[PDB]
């Protein structure tokens, strides 16, 4: 049985709530929609009749 | 009045307890250089001598005269307390390694950077049993030697080397004292 074995590795400790905090409170989303191009591409609808 | 650098260790305040993880700066100082206490173990002859030093053991016990039972008897029980002494007794390095970055994990924990069930810890388990089975044909005919040798050898020679006494500290008041927990 011994022999048999397969040689891993202690695993790592869980995250306590306050990782967690710290962690989600430096995540940065994206915004919606993309405004950066919404001036150079607006003509379509200034030319609509 | 608050520490600016917590770096300060812990005794356990009870009695069955683990010691704790370490933290970023710990692991960074572990892991930065090659640790000269535990990585003569994997080089040339290492487990050749493990085999030399008992027959040699047997050898001078032998000399000692006394009948085969006795001889091998005190063979099994001298290794099998050499080899606690030296590997689960004394914890930290001999020499200044960092910060100290090892100060309460003995030499059997510090094997091969904490993998466990390697091929040397392997040898190391198979060794204390391979020795018993030898020496189990002489002193088979007595109860009390054979009772005694079977728990020295099941208790101090396989117990802590079990996956699961890995960072187990036992710590009652009178005889062993507060461990070290960080
Ligand atoms: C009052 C009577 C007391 C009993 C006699 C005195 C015994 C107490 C002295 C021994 C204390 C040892 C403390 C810890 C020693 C090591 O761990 C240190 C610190 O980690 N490591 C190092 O220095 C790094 C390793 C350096 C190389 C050491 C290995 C050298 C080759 C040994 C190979 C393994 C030998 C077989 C396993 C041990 C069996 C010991 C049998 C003992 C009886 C036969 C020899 C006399």
């Not at chain 2, 091929?119 to 204390?128: H, N």
Request: contains cysteine; aromatic residues 10%; proline residues 6%.
């Amino acid at each position: 049985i011994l022999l048999t074995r397969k040689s891993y590795k202690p695993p790592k400790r869980p995250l306590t709530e306050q990782e967690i905090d710290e962690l989600c409170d430096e995540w940065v989303p994206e915004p919606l929609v993309d405004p950066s191009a919404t001036d150079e591409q607006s003509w379509r609808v200034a030319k609509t009749p | 009045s608050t520490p600016v650098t917590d770096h300060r260790r812990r005794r356990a305040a009870a009695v069955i307890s683990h010691v704790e993880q370490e933290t970023f700066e710990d692991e960074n100082d572990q892991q930065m250089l090659p640790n000269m206490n535990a990585t003569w173990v994997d080089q040339r002859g290492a487990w050749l001598i493990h085999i030399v030093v008992i027959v040699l053991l047997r050898l001078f016990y032998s000399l000692f005269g006394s009948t085969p039972k006795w001889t091998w008897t005190l063979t099994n029980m001298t290794y099998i307390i050499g080899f606690y002494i030296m590997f689960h007794l004394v914890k930290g390095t001999p020499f200044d390694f960092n910060g100290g970055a090892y100060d309460n994990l003995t030499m059997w924990e510090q094997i091969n950077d904490e993998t466990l069930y390697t091929p040397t810890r392997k040898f190391l388990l198979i060794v204390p049993i391979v020795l018993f089975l030898i020496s189990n044909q002489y002193y088979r005919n007595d109860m009390t030697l054979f009772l005694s040798n079977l728990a020295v050898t099941v208790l101090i020679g396989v117990v802590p080397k079990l996956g699961i006494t890995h960072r187990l500290r036992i710590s009652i008041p009178g005889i062993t004292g507060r461990a070290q927990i960080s």
